[PDB]
Design a protein around this ligand. Structure first.
Ligand SMILES: [Zn+2]
Length: 116
């Protein structure tokens, strides 16, 4: 599927949330609605981030304009579409498309992780 939210996987753990957002600027395409680096309970990066866009085509054009040019520290970064993952709100599973309660960490149907 295609969506407004974009999942960047395999990011170097040494990379901070400010390093990403500054790099998000000066990129081609519509500037995103938000840039979300997922961190640990200690605060260290979990290695993946969420880049949300306002409309659908702003995400596809950004996916189209950067699915070859997103290299950081020499390592290519995987780029996948993802259902919206906003703070506090409900989330649709990416593996079985079921809508889950917001406080649910694992999926109700297939048990897939919220960020899997
Ligand atoms: Zn599921």
């Amino acid at each position: 599927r295609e969506s407004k939210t974009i999942m960047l996987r395999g990011l170097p753990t040494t990379i901070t949330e400010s390093d990403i957002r500054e790099m998000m600027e000066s990129f081609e395409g519509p500037q995103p609605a938000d840039v979300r680096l997922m961190k640990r309970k200690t605060g260290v990066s979990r290695g993946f981030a969420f880049v949300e866009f306002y409309h659908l085509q702003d995400a596809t054009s950004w996916m189209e304009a950067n699915q070859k040019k997103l290299v950081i520290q020499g390592k290519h970064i995987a780029m996948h579409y993802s259902n919206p993952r906003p703070k506090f709100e409900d989330w649709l599973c990416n593996k079985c498309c079921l809508n889950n309660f917001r406080k649910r960490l694992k999926c109700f149907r297939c048990g897939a992780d919220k960020f899997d």
